[PDB]
Write an enzyme that holds these catalytic residues in place. Structure first.
Site, PDB file in Angstrom:
ATOM      1  N   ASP A 110      13.158  23.868 -19.259  1.00  0.00           N
ATOM      2  CA  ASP A 110      14.440  23.246 -18.840  1.00  0.00           C
ATOM      3  C   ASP A 110      15.247  24.302 -17.896  1.00  0.00           C
ATOM      4  O   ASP A 110      14.968  25.486 -17.521  1.00  0.00           O
ATOM      5  CB  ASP A 110      14.974  23.091 -20.111  1.00  0.00           C
ATOM      6  N   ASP A 158      19.019  22.497 -34.556  1.00  0.00           N
ATOM      7  CA  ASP A 158      18.991  21.226 -34.920  1.00  0.00           C
ATOM      8  C   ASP A 158      17.572  20.472 -34.372  1.00  0.00           C
ATOM      9  O   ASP A 158      17.440  19.362 -34.474  1.00  0.00           O
ATOM     10  CB  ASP A 158      19.708  20.343 -33.812  1.00  0.00           C
ATOM     11  N   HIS A 189      15.346  20.864 -32.141  1.00  0.00           N
ATOM     12  CA  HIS A 189      14.961  20.666 -30.744  1.00  0.00           C
ATOM     13  C   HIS A 189      13.890  21.356 -30.176  1.00  0.00           C
ATOM     14  O   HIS A 189      13.549  22.324 -30.404  1.00  0.00           O
ATOM     15  CB  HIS A 189      16.135  20.361 -29.741  1.00  0.00           C
ATOM     16  N   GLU A 204      17.433  16.972 -27.577  1.00  0.00           N
ATOM     17  CA  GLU A 204      18.498  17.052 -28.532  1.00  0.00           C
ATOM     18  C   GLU A 204      18.177  15.849 -29.691  1.00  0.00           C
ATOM     19  O   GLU A 204      17.337  14.729 -29.515  1.00  0.00           O
ATOM     20  CB  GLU A 204      19.832  16.928 -28.094  1.00  0.00           C
TER      21      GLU A 204
HETATM   22  N1  LIG Z   1      15.878  25.283 -24.338  1.00  0.00           N
HETATM   23  C1  LIG Z   1      14.801  25.495 -25.028  1.00  0.00           C
HETATM   24  C2  LIG Z   1      13.993  26.656 -24.260  1.00  0.00           C
HETATM   25  O1  LIG Z   1      14.095  27.144 -22.848  1.00  0.00           O
HETATM   26  C3  LIG Z   1      14.994  25.414 -26.647  1.00  0.00           C
HETATM   27  O2  LIG Z   1      13.359  24.926 -26.585  1.00  0.00           O
HETATM   28  C4  LIG Z   1      15.035  26.707 -27.193  1.00  0.00           C
HETATM   29  O3  LIG Z   1      13.415  26.985 -27.831  1.00  0.00           O
HETATM   30  C5  LIG Z   1      15.839  26.713 -28.399  1.00  0.00           C
HETATM   31  O4  LIG Z   1      17.092  26.613 -28.055  1.00  0.00           O
HETATM   32  C6  LIG Z   1      15.784  28.328 -29.204  1.00  0.00           C
HETATM   33  O5  LIG Z   1      16.546  29.079 -28.525  1.00  0.00           O
HETATM   34  P1  LIG Z   1      16.410  30.561 -29.129  1.00  0.00           P
HETATM   35  O6  LIG Z   1      15.209  31.208 -28.441  1.00  0.00           O
HETATM   36  O7  LIG Z   1      17.980  30.998 -28.350  1.00  0.00           O
HETATM   37  O8  LIG Z   1      16.683  30.370 -30.700  1.00  0.00           O
END
Ligand SMILES: N[C@@H](CO)[C@@H](O)[C@H](O)[C@H](O)COP(=O)(O)O
Ligand SMILES: OC[C@H]1O[C@H](O[C@H]2O[C@H](CO)[C@@H](O)[C@H](O)[C@H]2O)[C@H](O)[C@@H](O)[C@@H]1O
Ligand SMILES: OC[C@H]1O[C@H](O[C@H]2O[C@H](CO)[C@@H](O)[C@H](O)[C@H]2O)[C@H](O)[C@@H](O)[C@@H]1O
Ligand SMILES: OC[C@H]1O[C@H](O[C@H]2O[C@H](CO)[C@@H](O)[C@H](O)[C@H]2O)[C@H](O)[C@@H](O)[C@@H]1O
Ligand SMILES: OC[C@H]1O[C@H](O[C@H]2O[C@H](CO)[C@@H](O)[C@H](O)[C@H]2O)[C@H](O)[C@@H](O)[C@@H]1O
Ligand SMILES: OC[C@H]1O[C@H](O[C@H]2O[C@H](CO)[C@@H](O)[C@H](O)[C@H]2O)[C@H](O)[C@@H](O)[C@@H]1O
Ligand SMILES: OC[C@H]1O[C@H](O[C@H]2O[C@H](CO)[C@@H](O)[C@H](O)[C@H]2O)[C@H](O)[C@@H](O)[C@@H]1O
Ligand SMILES: CC(=O)N[C@@H]1[C@@H](O)[C@H](O)[C@@H](COP(=O)(O)O)O[C@@H]1O
Ligand SMILES: CC(=O)N[C@@H]1[C@@H](O)[C@H](O)[C@@H](COP(=O)(O)O)O[C@@H]1O
Ligand SMILES: CC(=O)N[C@@H]1[C@@H](O)[C@H](O)[C@@H](COP(=O)(O)O)O[C@@H]1O
Ligand SMILES: CC(=O)N[C@@H]1[C@@H](O)[C@H](O)[C@@H](COP(=O)(O)O)O[C@@H]1O
Ligand SMILES: CC(=O)N[C@@H]1[C@@H](O)[C@H](O)[C@@H](COP(=O)(O)O)O[C@@H]1O
Ligand SMILES: CC(=O)N[C@@H]1[C@@H](O)[C@H](O)[C@@H](COP(=O)(O)O)O[C@@H]1O
Ligand SMILES: N[C@@H](CO)[C@@H](O)[C@H](O)[C@H](O)COP(=O)(O)O
Ligand SMILES: N[C@@H](CO)[C@@H](O)[C@H](O)[C@H](O)COP(=O)(O)O
Ligand SMILES: N[C@@H](CO)[C@@H](O)[C@H](O)[C@H](O)COP(=O)(O)O
Ligand SMILES: N[C@@H](CO)[C@@H](O)[C@H](O)[C@H](O)COP(=O)(O)O
Ligand SMILES: N[C@@H](CO)[C@@H](O)[C@H](O)[C@H](O)COP(=O)(O)O
Lengths: 274, 281, 274, 274, 274, 274
Positions: free
Chosen positions: F72, F141, F143, F148
């Site tokens: 992303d 959450d 994801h 989301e």
């Molecule tokens: N946006 C994704 C990764 O670029 C998201 O999957 C990520 O794995 C999730 O937000 C965990 O973030 P963290 O590594 O900061 O815990």
């Protein structure tokens, strides 16, 4: 709650035995101050009874000033029948220790007036000053004594009809035939056990894991009567690893971390010797 | 708990009526020993009330020495309104029996000081010596009386604001229009009902199945207040088949197995009439 | 229960302060009738304390006839350690108001016999006539005071070992090191708080949403001790919008509809000025 | 799904046998059109096999043009070991019917390259044109074959390490010693079974009630792999009363109401006799 | 998924009608490119149908090149019976618009071979190039069409026996008497609807709140068949405030926050006028 | 699934790095056979990237024939911004290894046509022959990427609006200002990741324990998108002790029992050095 976790059945049985031993000795009962003990039957507490007998024979523990009250007994089954709880207690424990026969109390499942027998049992507990330590177990359906699912959480001693789980679990003791197991039993109530100053529930085996989970991870529910002790001021759950399989990792880690503190309840191990 | 399961509404209604009848007769109330009965309203207990009236007309049951306390009443609704609980009890039960008017008690939802009216209700219950048998029902939201989701499980009589489910379910009694249903009601508390020596909850219909499941299969939770009775020493749940639809098969099997024992509560059926002279041995 | 829902932390903090202010003033405490107040520490109640101080400085509220009992204190931390709850209460509240020092009570985490200290605390509460209003908070794990998951719902004041959850959350006060957070604390029990005539739990932030959901949408469960208040006659939950994120829409709609009625608890806002 | 409910084990066993009988006969397999049947082992299908044998001995059913594929086999157990699934199938079924040995396929748990053996098994199923009817059971932990909790729901035939529940349940077949139960097994995958044109799961006993509840009342979850069939177009569950103990009354009533329609699957009962 | 939330039934109905209107117009159907629309019956879609009719009468929308396929129809009911779905569609929609009868398709519950009728229905859908937009509803039991609890999530058009919930909900349409309600119905399967390029589920009223929660807050489960769309690439749920009562606050806040973005789907509103 | 459990963050990070290293080396990528790697951003994978860099610097691993596709990127944020994912990847990984820039692919959150940019990303993945190994993380959450809660489980690359949890969690990178976190992002879909031949999810910390529990202990649910991998044939979850706190003891015991087996995936550790 205090959740005590040991590796195997023998270890859990031993911990429970040591605890009862220390409690009796430190209580230091006498002619005018008996130690009242509520007791269970079954294969689960057998290991504990065996260890208590060992401590007695070794001269480290005495039951001379101990009064006992068993949680239940089958209705309509001869007292001398080998599968009666009266027979279970006498052959596996009482005849091997220095307790006075008159100070052991077991519900009479053949009383002419069953309800009167139950009411009288409650009066005996009251006359003895209440129960100091009530030892119990948990059924696959989460029951305490014979307070089957759907039993009032403030129930007193009364007649109860055994549920499916209980019949199936005890069929083996009656030629493996379900219809052979007594249909009813006289049992202390959830409230009766809750009235004890302390409650110790012994749980061993993977077959009890789900019930333990229901009793201490889910909430107060009359479908899993051991859950009632979430509202008891002093309950101790003693189990082996297998009985913890359905609990959350966080819970087991918390209590395993507390074993250093809780082991002081059995170490040092006291003795009546000198 | 004792869970009684009957085939249809008529049978469930009848069982409840027979039980009340036997309890009253065997209690044998008199001038210095009244039988105090807590009561509900609604379509559910109507069948029970009708049977009780039948028993009275047949000369088998008398309410002369019975005192009643209804669980609730709407706030701000005319007492003579066809939908008030005062009107429900008068027209569906009291005017058809021999109970004394001074011995029937219903909360006054039109009192200027509502909390004082509620506190006075508790005083009357106490003065009567407590409730011997409290009959109730269960709402779609699992409520006992108007102890809506989120009510203290040890609450006493007080003012309560009706929740969505109750409003919608009761919208049919007011031109089927929502905002027409009284916003509040005076209601006995969960604790008030719990103080009764015995509690009997009548549940009928598939529309109550989920609430019953929440109340007796899931645990003590103030979101489904009838669940409070899991901690009452003597509660009886009387339902018909449709009300058990959400329960586990194992639970229904167990209690259906106890129906022979539990039917002893309504069989034999007692009567105040004189004993048969021609009875031998 | 009464669930009061405000927009932001500031507004929730203020509502709680206004309520405490009205309760004390309407109670009208005097030399032979003190107002007993149970209190919490932490960032959550800080806003409430600041408003209470403002009311005092403005001459609208007096704590001269108020006695306070804090819910807990760390075991082993020097009384004057900047992170002790003794220090938190003195620096963030007591030194800024007219409450008498001898009327403020906090558990002594440095006592040798910890349980004896806890029992003494309970005696002090009894001597003061019980708690009129106990203010508290909820932990991310649903705890009230330090009654960590798995605590008896009828517990009294005693020593408790902090759960990982609490350790993680408080590490920021000890140089961000988990190993530096006190391992145990002295804490009032769930039963101790339940004995209060009224209980007000202040909850703010999305990080408390799941715990709030567990405490009021799910049932009585010793794993989420604030759920015990479902069986208290007079409990008030005061939260901000973010704290309601895990609740059902129906629940929030119901209580938001009661805000007009509940705001009568803080409006009119009384003053000792007449 | 089609949920078939019979009174006792014997009746459930018979219904399954009658269905298999009718499906094979109406399929009318021949030298150029075999009927492929996926099969399970264990005490559960025992009654079914006994009935199928009776049908054969009576000249009502022939397995001459039937090819079978068993869902699994223990790794490491000598093929001729009395507890191997090869042995179970031979002694309890194959040696009693007219099925050709070369048309019965069971994973070789003694192969050196386990994955190669599994891949070869999948090729054989494909070469046979897929599975017409796959008969299976459910484990106490909800597993299909040896797809233990946590198995990919689209998994293919592979090696799997038995979970605790499986070991405990199968210990009875190894002198009641848990340490004697093979640690691993070769098993068809969840996807392998899902590829069958029709799936029939036989479930009997109260000890399977919770697993059945998890598999059909709760959702698709890899923790209870039989739940995967909620996304299969033609699955049939055959059970006895005891297996339905954890289901909602509504569910059982709905399907019992469909028994008149579903019994047309076994009534009339066809025969090869002409 | 896209969860659209309007305040009242009328607003939700309008949003749905506006969306269908824009989809048809922008699709710009012709004699060689028809717009295939799947449709539901019942009171829920009534408002939507009324708006579509208004749009047509105002000369803003044409159904000349639209083909429709209804999700179900009762078995054993006279095609021209007032309670038949054939009648519901003709009276509430078809007779008020410019769609051609030859292009409206509804299952014939009186066909000699019901299964053949269902298979033929699937062929017609395929012959029409599939369904562009399938509009549906949700039952109190979470069903899509007549895919009652326990229906295969990959099911095709077939015969289904109505469940308790559905019967009790339609009993009023048949003199409020339960046995009068048709026992069976022909219905597209869950897989059938899942094959649509886009699915729009219309939900209104507090009596559907629990089902909605089960369908989108809990996971994929054949007990609540609308939950199947969690695995559909393009599903839109349109509801009114009351239908969201059982959902978590966080979920509703998230989607209400996306309403400005999603309103671009119905604003601007297109018209076939020059 | 394979659940790998290490003691702390550092160990989990290293295991993941070792696995990626072995997979690339044994794959033996070349001019006509590139190794396609899907990658995530955030603090979780940082440790892994650091280790991979070490392996490169030591001359044991080469990314010369590796192509990468990031899951992303923020919409509307300047690519040059220090917190853009383009900046994260180049400053924390790409500029430190020997991977060719033209072979690194990250979504352009500032493209004129966002959906076109997304569709183009899917085409690039296809042109590359698909993803060999997709590395990801899990949000509080549950994801995967920015799919989301309430995201289609078969979604492709598209624009998504961040949910409150993601906003709150990512605010730490924008001076703690929630409103400073970009509102939307371009993100591969659940289906896009599910299309990878292998998926490895790195999960570390107690703040992720509940999400992990939801993702692997509860069923397939679009509210916790990582749960989608229960239906993926080859998913590997790599976590540390703290991330397993909400799981059942039985689950953790099963996988810790398989650690010797799974460590064979990183032991021996290979190198490009001859
Ligand atoms: N946006 C994704 C990764 O670029 C998201 O999957 C990520 O794995 C999730 O937000 C965990 O973030 P963290 O590594 O900061 O815990
Ligand atoms: O368990 C150790 C404690 O034993 C004593 O307390 C028990 O026995 C007393 C009677 O002799 C009771 O009054 C008391 O309630 C029991 O707990 C000992 O007296 C204590 O010092 C020990 O802590
Ligand atoms: O319901 C049957 C029982 O009725 C009597 O018990 C009720 O009435 C008494 C007053 O007359 C109360 O003391 C008692 O608490 C009531 O239950 C009868 O007296 C009993 O024999 C029956 O079991
Ligand atoms: O909170 C408002 C009420 O305050 C009084 O009631 C409190 O203070 C009294 C002491 O003076 C106590 O007896 C009482 O229990 C407290 O609630 C006031 O006296 C009431 O009228 C108000 O409702
Ligand atoms: O089960 C009853 C049906 O049996 C036939 O259908 C089976 O066997 C055929 C091969 O001979 C296959 O083509 C078919 O897929 C099987 O289901 C019979 O041919 C049918 O009439 C019966 O409905
Ligand atoms: O809904 C708006 C879009 O409408 C068109 O897309 C639809 O109709 C086309 C046929 O005419 C199909 O190719 C397509 O699959 C449908 O979605 C319009 O062509 C687009 O530009 C709009 O975005
Ligand atoms: O991971 C170890 C395996 O590596 C090879 O398999 C990978 O690389 C091949 C060539 O690029 C692919 O065909 C294959 O799909 C990859 O997994 C090695 O060739 C195997 O023997 C090892 O098991
Ligand atoms: C023969 C028999 O089984 N009698 C029991 C009775 O003793 C018990 O009081 C009641 C409620 O169960 P409870 O007391 O646990 O609530 O159920 C039964 O009617
Ligand atoms: C108008 C009204 O609705 N008043 C009620 C009040 O009577 C009740 O005591 C309180 C808590 O509910 P509870 O008593 O059940 O806990 O809620 C409301 O503020
Ligand atoms: C050092 C410590 O942690 N001691 C506590 C003890 O004070 C408490 O009574 C018991 C049960 O917890 P409970 O009282 O809440 O049920 O747990 C521990 O053994
Ligand atoms: C010795 C052993 O137990 N090996 C299995 C392996 O065959 C399987 O593929 C993987 C995932 O389980 P899954 O395939 O069901 O997802 O777990 C193990 O590492
Ligand atoms: C008369 C009738 O009700 N027949 C249905 C049948 O059409 C359906 O295929 C099967 C399974 O339900 P399912 O297809 O949804 O899985 O159930 C019934 O036996
Ligand atoms: C600006 C924005 O947020 N757009 C998204 C859109 O890209 C997505 O397709 C849809 C459904 O979510 P889903 O694709 O995961 O089902 O939600 C939104 O309307
Ligand atoms: N009523 C008791 C014995 O029948 C019961 O409390 C017991 O603890 C439970 O049924 C377990 O029995 P076990 O000791 O055989 O495991
Ligand atoms: N408010 C109470 C009326 O007695 C409550 O128990 C009531 O019975 C409940 O709302 C159900 O109403 P019903 O009896 O009309 O179903
Ligand atoms: N010691 C605090 C433990 O973190 C606890 O007293 C309190 O009940 C709760 O955790 C509130 O903490 P907060 O003020 O930081 O939200
Ligand atoms: N793998 C199978 C047998 O080993 C398993 O799926 C079986 O269905 C389950 O373990 C129950 O065995 P049972 O047939 O002995 O009940
Ligand atoms: N059978 C469908 C109607 O044709 C059924 O899907 C419908 O969507 C559902 O039963 C809801 O009905 P309602 O619109 O009448 O609430």
């Amino acid at each position: 709650m205090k959740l005590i976790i040991l590796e195997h059945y023998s270890q859990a049985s031993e911990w429970a035995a040591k605890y009862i031993r220390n409690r009796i000795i430190q209580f230091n009962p006498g002619p005018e101050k008996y130690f009242t003990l509520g007791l269970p039957t079954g294969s689960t507490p057998l290991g504990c009874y065996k260890k208590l007998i060992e401590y007695y024979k070794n001269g480290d523990l005495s039951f001379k000033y101990v009064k006992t009250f068993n949680m239940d007994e089958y209705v309509g089954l001869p007292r001398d029948h080998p599968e009666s709880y009266h027979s279970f207690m006498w052959n596996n424990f009482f005849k091997h220790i220095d307790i006075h026969p008159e100070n052991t109390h077991i519900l009479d499942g053949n009383a002419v007036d069953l309800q009167a027998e139950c009411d009288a049992f409650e009066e005996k507990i009251k006359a003895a000053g209440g129960i100091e330590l009530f030892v119990g177990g948990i059924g696959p359906d989460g029951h305490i004594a014979f307070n089957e699912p759907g039993s009032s959480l403030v129930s007193r001693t009364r007649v109860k009809t055994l549920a499916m789980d209980t019949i199936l679990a005890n069929a083996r003791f009656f030629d493996g035939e379900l219809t052979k197991v007594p249909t009813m039993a006289l049992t202390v109530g959830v409230g009766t056990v809750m009235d004890a100053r302390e409650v110790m529930i012994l749980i061993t085996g993977a077959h009890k894991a789900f019930a333990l989970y229901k009793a201490i991870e889910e909430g107060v529910n009359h479908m899993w009567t051991v859950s009632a002790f979430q509202q008891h001021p002093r309950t101790v759950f003693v189990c082996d690893e297998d009985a913890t399989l359905e609990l959350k990792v966080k819970t087991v880690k918390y209590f395993k971390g507390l074993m250093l503190v809780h082991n002081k309840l059995v170490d040092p191990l006291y003795s009546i010797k000198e």
